[PDB]
Structure formats: structure tokens, C-alpha cells
Coordinates of C-alpha atoms in Angstrom, one line a residue:
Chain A
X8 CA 0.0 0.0 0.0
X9 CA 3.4 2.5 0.2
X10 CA 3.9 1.1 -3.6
X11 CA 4.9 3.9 -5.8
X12 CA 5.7 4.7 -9.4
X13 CA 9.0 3.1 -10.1
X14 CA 11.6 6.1 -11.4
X15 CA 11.9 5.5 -14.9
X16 CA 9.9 4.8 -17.7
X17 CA 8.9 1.1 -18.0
X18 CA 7.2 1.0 -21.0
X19 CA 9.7 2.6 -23.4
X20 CA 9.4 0.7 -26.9
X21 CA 7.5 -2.9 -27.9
X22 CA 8.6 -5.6 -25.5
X23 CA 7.2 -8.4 -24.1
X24 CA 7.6 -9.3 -20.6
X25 CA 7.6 -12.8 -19.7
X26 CA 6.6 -12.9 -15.3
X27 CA 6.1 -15.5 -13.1
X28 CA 2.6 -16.9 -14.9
X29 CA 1.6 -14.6 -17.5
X30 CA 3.2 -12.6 -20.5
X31 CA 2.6 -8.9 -21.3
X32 CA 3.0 -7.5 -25.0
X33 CA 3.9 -3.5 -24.6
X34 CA 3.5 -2.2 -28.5
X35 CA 4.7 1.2 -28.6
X36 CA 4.5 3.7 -32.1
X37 CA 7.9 5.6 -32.1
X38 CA 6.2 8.9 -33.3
X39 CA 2.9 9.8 -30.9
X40 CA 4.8 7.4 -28.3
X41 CA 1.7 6.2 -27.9
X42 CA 1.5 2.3 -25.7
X43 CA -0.9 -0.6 -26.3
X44 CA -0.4 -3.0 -23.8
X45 CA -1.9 -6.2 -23.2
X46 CA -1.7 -9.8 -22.3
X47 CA 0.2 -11.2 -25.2
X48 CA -2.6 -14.1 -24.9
X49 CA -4.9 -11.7 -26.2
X50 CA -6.1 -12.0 -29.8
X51 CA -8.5 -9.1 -30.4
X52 CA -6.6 -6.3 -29.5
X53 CA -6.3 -4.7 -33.6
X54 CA -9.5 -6.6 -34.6
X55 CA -11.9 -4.6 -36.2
X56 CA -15.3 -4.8 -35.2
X57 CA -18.0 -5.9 -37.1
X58 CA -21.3 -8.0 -37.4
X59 CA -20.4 -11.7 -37.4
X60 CA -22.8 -12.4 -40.3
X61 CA -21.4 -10.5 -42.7
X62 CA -18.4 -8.8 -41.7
X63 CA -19.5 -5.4 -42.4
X64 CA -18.0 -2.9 -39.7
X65 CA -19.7 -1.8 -36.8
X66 CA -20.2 1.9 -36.4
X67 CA -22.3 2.9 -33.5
X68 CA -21.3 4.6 -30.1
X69 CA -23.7 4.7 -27.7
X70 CA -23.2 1.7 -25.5
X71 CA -27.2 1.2 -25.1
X72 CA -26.8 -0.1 -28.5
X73 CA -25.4 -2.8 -27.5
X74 CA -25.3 -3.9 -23.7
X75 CA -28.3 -3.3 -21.0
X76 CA -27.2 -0.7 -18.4
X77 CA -26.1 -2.1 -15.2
X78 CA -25.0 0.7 -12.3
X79 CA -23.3 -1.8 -10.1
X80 CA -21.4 -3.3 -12.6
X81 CA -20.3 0.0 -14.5
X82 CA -19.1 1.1 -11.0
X83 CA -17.4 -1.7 -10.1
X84 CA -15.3 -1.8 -13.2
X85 CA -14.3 1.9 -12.0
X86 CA -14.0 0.8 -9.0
X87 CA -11.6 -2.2 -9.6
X88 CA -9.3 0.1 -11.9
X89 CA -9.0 2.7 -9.3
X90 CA -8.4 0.6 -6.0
X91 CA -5.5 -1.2 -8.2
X92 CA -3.4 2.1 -8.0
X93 CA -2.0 3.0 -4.1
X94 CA -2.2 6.3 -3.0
X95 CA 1.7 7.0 -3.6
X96 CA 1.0 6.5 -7.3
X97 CA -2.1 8.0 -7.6
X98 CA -1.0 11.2 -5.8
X99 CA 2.0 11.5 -8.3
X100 CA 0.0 10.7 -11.5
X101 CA -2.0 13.6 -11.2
X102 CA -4.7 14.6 -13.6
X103 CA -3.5 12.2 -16.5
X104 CA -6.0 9.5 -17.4
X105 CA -5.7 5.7 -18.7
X106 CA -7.1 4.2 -21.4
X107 CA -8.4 0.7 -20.8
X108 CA -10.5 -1.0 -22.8
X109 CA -12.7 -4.8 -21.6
X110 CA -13.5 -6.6 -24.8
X111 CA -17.3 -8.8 -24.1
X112 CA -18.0 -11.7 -25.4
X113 CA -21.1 -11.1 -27.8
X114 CA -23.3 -14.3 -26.1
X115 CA -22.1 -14.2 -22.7
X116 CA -21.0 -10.6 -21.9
X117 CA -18.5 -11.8 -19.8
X118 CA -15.1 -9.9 -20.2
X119 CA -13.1 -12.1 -23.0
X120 CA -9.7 -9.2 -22.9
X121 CA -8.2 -6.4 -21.4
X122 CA -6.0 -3.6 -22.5
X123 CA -4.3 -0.8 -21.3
X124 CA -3.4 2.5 -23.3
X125 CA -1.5 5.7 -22.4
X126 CA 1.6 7.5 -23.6
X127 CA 5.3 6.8 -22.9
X128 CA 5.5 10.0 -21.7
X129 CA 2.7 9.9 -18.9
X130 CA 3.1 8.1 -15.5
X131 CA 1.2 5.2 -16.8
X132 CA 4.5 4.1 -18.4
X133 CA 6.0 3.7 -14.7
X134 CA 3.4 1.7 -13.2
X135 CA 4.2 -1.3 -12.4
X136 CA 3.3 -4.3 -14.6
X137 CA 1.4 -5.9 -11.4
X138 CA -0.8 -3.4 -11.2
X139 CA -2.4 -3.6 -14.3
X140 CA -2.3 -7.3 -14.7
X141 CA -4.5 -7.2 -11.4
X142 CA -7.0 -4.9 -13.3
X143 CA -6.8 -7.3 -16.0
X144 CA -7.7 -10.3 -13.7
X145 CA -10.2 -8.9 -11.4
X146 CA -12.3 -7.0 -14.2
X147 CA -12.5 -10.4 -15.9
X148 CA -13.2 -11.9 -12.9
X149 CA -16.3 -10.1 -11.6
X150 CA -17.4 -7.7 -14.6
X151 CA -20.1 -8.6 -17.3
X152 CA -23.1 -7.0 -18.8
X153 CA -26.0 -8.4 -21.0
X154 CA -25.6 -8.2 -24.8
X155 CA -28.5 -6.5 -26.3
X156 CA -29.6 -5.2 -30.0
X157 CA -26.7 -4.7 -32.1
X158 CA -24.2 -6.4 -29.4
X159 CA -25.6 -9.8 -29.8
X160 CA -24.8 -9.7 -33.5
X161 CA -21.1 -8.6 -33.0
X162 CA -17.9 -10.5 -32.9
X163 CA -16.6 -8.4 -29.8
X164 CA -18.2 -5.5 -27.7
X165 CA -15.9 -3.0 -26.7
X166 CA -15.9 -0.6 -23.8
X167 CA -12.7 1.5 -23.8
X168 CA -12.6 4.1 -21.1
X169 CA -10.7 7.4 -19.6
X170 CA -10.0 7.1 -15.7
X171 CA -7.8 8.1 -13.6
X172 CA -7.2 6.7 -10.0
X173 CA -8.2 8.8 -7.3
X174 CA -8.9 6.8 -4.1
X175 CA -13.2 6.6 -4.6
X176 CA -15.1 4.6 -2.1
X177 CA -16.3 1.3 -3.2
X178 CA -20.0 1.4 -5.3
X179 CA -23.1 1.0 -3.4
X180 CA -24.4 -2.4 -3.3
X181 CA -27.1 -3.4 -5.8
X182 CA -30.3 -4.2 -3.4
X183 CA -30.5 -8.3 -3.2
X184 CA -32.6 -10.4 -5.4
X185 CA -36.2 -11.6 -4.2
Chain B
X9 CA -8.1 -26.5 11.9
X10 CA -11.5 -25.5 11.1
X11 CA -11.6 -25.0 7.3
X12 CA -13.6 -23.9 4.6
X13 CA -17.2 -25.5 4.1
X14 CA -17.8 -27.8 1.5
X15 CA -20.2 -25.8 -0.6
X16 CA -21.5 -22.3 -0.9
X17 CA -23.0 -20.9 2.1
X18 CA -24.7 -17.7 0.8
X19 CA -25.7 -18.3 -2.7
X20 CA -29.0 -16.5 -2.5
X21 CA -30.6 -14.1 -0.4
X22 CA -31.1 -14.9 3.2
X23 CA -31.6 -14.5 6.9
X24 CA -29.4 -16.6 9.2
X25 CA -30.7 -16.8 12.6
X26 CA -28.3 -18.2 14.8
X27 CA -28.6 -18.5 18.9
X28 CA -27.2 -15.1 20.0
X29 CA -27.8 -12.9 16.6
X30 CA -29.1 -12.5 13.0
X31 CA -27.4 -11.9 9.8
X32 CA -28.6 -10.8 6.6
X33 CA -27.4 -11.9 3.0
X34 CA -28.3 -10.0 0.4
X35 CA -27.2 -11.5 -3.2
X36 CA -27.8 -9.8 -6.5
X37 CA -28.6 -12.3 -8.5
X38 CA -26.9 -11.2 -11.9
X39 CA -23.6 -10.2 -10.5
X40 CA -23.3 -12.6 -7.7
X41 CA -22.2 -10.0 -5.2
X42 CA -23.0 -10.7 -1.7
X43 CA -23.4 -8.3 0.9
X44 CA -23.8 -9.6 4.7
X45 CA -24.3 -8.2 7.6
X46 CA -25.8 -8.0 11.0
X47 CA -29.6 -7.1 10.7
X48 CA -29.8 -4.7 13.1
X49 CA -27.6 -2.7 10.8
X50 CA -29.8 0.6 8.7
X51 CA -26.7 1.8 6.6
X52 CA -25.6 -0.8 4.5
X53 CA -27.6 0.6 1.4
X54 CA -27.5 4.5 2.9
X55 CA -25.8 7.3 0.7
X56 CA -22.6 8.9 1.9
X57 CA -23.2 12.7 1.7
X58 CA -22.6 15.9 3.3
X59 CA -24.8 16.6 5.6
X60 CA -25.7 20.2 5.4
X61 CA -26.7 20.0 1.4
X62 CA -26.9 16.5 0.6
X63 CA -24.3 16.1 -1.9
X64 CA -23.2 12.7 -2.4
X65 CA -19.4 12.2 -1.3
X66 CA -17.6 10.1 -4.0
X67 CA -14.1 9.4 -2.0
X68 CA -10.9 10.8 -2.6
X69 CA -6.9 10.5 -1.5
X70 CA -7.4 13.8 -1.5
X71 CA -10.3 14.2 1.3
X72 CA -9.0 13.1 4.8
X73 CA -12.2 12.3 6.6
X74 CA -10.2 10.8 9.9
X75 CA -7.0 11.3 11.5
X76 CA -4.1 9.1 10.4
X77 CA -3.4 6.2 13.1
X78 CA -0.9 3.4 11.8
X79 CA -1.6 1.4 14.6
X80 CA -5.2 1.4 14.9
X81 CA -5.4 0.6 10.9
X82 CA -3.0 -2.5 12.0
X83 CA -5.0 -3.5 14.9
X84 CA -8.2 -3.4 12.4
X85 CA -6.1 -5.7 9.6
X86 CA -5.0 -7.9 13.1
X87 CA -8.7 -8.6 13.6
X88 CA -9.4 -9.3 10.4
X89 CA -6.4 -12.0 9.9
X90 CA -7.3 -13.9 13.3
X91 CA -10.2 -14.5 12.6
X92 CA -9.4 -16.9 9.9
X93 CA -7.7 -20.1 10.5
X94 CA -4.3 -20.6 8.7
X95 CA -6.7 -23.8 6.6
X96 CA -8.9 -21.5 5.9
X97 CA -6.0 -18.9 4.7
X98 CA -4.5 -21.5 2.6
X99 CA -7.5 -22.5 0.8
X100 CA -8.5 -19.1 0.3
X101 CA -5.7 -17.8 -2.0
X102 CA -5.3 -14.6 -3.6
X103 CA -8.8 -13.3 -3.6
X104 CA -9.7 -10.5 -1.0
X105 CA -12.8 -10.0 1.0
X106 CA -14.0 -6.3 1.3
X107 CA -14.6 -5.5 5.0
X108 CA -16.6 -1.8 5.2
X109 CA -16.8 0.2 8.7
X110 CA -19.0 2.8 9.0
X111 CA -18.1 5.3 11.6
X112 CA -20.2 8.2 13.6
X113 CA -18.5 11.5 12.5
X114 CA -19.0 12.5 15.8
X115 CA -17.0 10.0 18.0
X116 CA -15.4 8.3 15.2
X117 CA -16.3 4.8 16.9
X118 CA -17.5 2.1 14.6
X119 CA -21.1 2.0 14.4
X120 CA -21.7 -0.7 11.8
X121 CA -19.4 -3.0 9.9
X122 CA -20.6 -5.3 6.5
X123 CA -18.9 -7.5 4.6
X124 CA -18.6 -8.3 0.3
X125 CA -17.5 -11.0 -1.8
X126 CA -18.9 -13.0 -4.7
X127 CA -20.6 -16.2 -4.6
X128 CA -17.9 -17.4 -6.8
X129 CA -15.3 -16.8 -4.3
X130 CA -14.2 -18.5 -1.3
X131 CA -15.7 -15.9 1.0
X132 CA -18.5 -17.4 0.1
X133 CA -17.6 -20.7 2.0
X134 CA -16.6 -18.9 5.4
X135 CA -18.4 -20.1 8.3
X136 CA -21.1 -17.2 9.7
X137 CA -19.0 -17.3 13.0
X138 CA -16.0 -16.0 11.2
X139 CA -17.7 -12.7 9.9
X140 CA -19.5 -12.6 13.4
X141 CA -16.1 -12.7 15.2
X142 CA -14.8 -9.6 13.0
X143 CA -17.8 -7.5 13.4
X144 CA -17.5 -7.6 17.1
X145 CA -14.2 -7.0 17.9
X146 CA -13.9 -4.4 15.3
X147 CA -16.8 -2.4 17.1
X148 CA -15.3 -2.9 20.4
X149 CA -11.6 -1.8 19.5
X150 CA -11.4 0.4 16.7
X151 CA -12.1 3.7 16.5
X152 CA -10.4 6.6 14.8
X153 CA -10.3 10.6 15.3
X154 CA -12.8 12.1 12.6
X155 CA -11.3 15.2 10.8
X156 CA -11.6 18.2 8.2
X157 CA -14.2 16.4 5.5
X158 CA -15.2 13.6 7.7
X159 CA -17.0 15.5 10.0
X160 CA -19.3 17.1 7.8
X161 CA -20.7 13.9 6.4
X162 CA -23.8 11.9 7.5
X163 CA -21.2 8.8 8.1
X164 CA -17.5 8.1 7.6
X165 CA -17.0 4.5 5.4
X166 CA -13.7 3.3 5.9
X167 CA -13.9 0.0 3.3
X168 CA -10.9 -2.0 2.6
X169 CA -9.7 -4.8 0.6
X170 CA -7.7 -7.7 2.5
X171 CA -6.8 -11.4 2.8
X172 CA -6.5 -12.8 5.7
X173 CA -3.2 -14.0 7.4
X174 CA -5.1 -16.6 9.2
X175 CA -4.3 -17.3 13.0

């Protein structure tokens, strides 16, 4: 929980770092310095989206398109993202915000991929790798929503997001069932 | 030696009364999240705001709503790893249980404390007595000096993530 940012740049230029139980892919593009980085198990992170049917692209953008709105679980995601960071790291990155994106399964909703974007220039790019594989774990873990209309028909639903840590309370339970 | 139960415990929602008190779990059925507490508690679904306009209070690093206290935070995570037994530790694993105190901005004593996990997890296979054990002695012990934001609020929430060392 004293955790900070470590004091250089982690994240310079594509690498993959191979941990203790999982492998990271870190694609950088040497002009905007811009990072993609992701579990290198992950096969959907370029993949265009489209309707499965036909492969026609997918233009849309507002997310009642294609998953039913769920308070709980849209605050939980948040949630998870920001309780990752401690408060050493999230007092010295400031205003700058993340990028992360959860990738749904079309049938399920359930949270198929995870990635991370930001810029090599930002204190994203000296957070520890730990960090955001934990993001990566508990979002998939605990975080789904319902496919509906045009989501159900798609090979991937994506929700990509700006946040930045900032130490918010946990979300308000949803009330139980029956 | 006490371990884990066998299957899920609080799968759906439910009252468990025991000889000496009642617990309520509440489970949303979609996400699986469990929340469970003592039924006497009233704030386990109540708003954090200020009090004087009714704003809600989101949570921030940057708002200190009690005084800092190392060792009172350690006695709190001392209660919470004791009352698990090193079995139940072991089975456990990575996965954290969220433990929530809600604190009078007046005294800063604990008035109410509730727990969450998902059905999925093994939280969800901890004996009643366990969660019991933490409530109480969390009550009795901890309290904390409520400062600058924290007492201007209907309620301070102090809610954590840990696993348990086990005894």
C-alpha cells in the first residue's frame, strides 16, 4: 500500500515481458509514443469490429446499442481500476488518465480481454506491470453486462474508457434479489 | 483446523438466525455479489453525503475524513487476519474480502461494519461465525479521530480490501 511509481519509464518501446505466470505485450509507435499494452494471450486487440454475419463494420457509439445498463457493474469496473493504484502512485500521476479497454463476449458478456493504453510520456509508463495485470484479472473476474440489439450480433463488444485513479469509495451495493 | 465449508453458504438471499444474533445476505442475482451483515444494521444501502446539502461524497486521496493512526489501521487488519484459520487462509488464496466500517462523524467509533465478496469466491464458503467474530471486535476496538471532511458527512466508510493471514 506505500507502492509507488517506479523512477523511470517502464514502458519505453515494444517488448514483451515474460513474469512468473503470464506474459505482457507492450506495443509502442515511435512517433505519438503512444503504448498498447496487453496480455500477449490476447487475440483481439487490432480486430476490427463488425457484425459476425457479414463482416460489415460496426459503427455505433452509444453503449445502449449494445449492452443493457447495469449501475453496479459500470461502478465496479471503475472501481476495480482505481483501488489497483495505491495512493503514492495516484497522488504523483495527477490529472492524467488511462485508457483501458474490456472486450465482451457477444453471447455471454462476460469480459473475454483487457488492455491498457496511455503514452510513454505519462506516468502510466511507470506503473508497475502488477498493477495492471491485477486490473486485468479482477475485471475479468467479476465484470459482465448483457448483450443486447446490435451487441448480440457482433464479434466483440468494446468498452474502452478514460480514468484516472483517485482513491473513490467502493459502489453502493445493488439491493439483493427476491 | 477449522476450514472452509464444502459448498457455498450464501448463494441466495437470506436470513441466518443463529442462537445469539441475525445476519442478513443480500445477493444480486446477476452479478453474484453478496453483501452480509448483521440485521440490526440501517446503513448498508445509505448514501454517503454531506450533511448540510446533501451532496453525495464520492471518495478521494485527497479528502481526509479521519486522523491518520498506523496502529489502529494495524489493529483493524490484526482482527481481520485472526479470525481466519491458517486452513482457511491456505484454501482461500489470492482473492480479497471487502470489509466496510461505517463510523459516527461525531465520536469516530464504529457503528456498523458489512462485509462483500462473490458467490464465486471462497468468502463465500466462510463459516457465519468468522464474519461474526470480526464484526464484534472491530466495534469494540477500533475507533479513529474524525477530521476536516469527515465530519461534515452523515457517516464516515472506511472499506478495505484484504486477505487474511489466518491465525
Amino acid at each position: 500500500t506505500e507502492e509507488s511509481l517506479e523512477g523511470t519509464v517502464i514502458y519505453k518501446k515494444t517488448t514483451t515481458f515474460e513474469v512468473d505466470g503470464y506474459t505482457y505485450q507492450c506495443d509502442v509507435d515511435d512517433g505519438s509514443q503512444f503504448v498498447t499494452l496487453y496480455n500477449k494471450e490476447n487475440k483481439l486487440t487490432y480486430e476490427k469490429i463488425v457484425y459476425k454475419d457479414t463482416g460489415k463494420t460496426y459503427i455505433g457509439s452509444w453503449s445502449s446499442n449494445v449492452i443493457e445498463y447495469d449501475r453496479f457493474m459500470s461502478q465496479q469496473a471503475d472501481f476495480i481500476v482505481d483501488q489497483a493504484f495505491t495512493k503514492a502512485m495516484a497522488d504523483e500521476i495527477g490529472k492524467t488518465e488511462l485508457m483501458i479497454t474490456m472486450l465482451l463476449s457477444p453471447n455471454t458478456g462476460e469480459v473475454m480481454e483487457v488492455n491498457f493504453n496511455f503514452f510513454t510520456f505519462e506516468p502510466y509508463a511507470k506503473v508497475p506491470l502488477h498493477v495492471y495485470r491485477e486490473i486485468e484479472v479482477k475485471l475479468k473476474e467479476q465484470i459482465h453486462f448483457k448483450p443486447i440489439e446490435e451487441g448480440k450480433q457482433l464479434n466483440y463488444i468494446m468498452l474502452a474508457w478514460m480514468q484516472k485513479p483517485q482513491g473513490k469509495l467502493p459502489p453502493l451495493p445493488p439491493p439483493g434479489s427476491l
